[PDB]
Amino acid sequence: HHHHFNLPPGNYKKPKLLYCSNGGHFLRILPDGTVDGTRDRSDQHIQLQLSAESVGEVYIKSTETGQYLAMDTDGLLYGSQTPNEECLFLERLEENHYNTYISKKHAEKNWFVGLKKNGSTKRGPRTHYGQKAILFLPLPV
């Protein structure tokens, strides 16, 4: 592979909030398919159900809308109505603590899910190992 295989603990039984320490935002997949971060813990669009494909590969699905987080060919996160290759992420432990999500499709380019401090998503190519934007903590809902 192009990436390590330190996996985070826990499981996919329950939905999670993906909290980005960077700006303190929860990853949000809006009904119109846009993705951003919100600090509003009560937001209905931050509840995400992760599920495994292969070990360490996940889908990240909005429980509210059913949309799958996906990263497009230009590195933009979006909500996909159906699971496609752009929707798979390599979920890894990072800094012995956080979860990171690398686009499987673009794994060789090290494109991560990331939220900037202002709650906007990072574009894939603007992410890289070592960043704060890429570091998530899955919180219970």
From Swiss-Prot:
Heparin-binding as annotated region, ranges: 116-132
Q: What positions does the record give for the motif labelled Nuclear localization signal?
A: 13-16
| GO BP term, example | wound healing
Instruction: Give the recorded effect for S120A.
Output: Decrease in LRRC59-binding
Q: What is this protein called?
A: Fibroblast growth factor 1
Subcellular location(s) of the protein = Secreted; Cytoplasm; Cytoplasm, Cell cortex; Cytoplasm, Cytosol
Q: What is the effect of changing S120E?
A: Decrease in LRRC59-binding
Instruction: Report one GO cellular component.
Output: cytosol
The organism named in the record is Homo sapiens (Human)
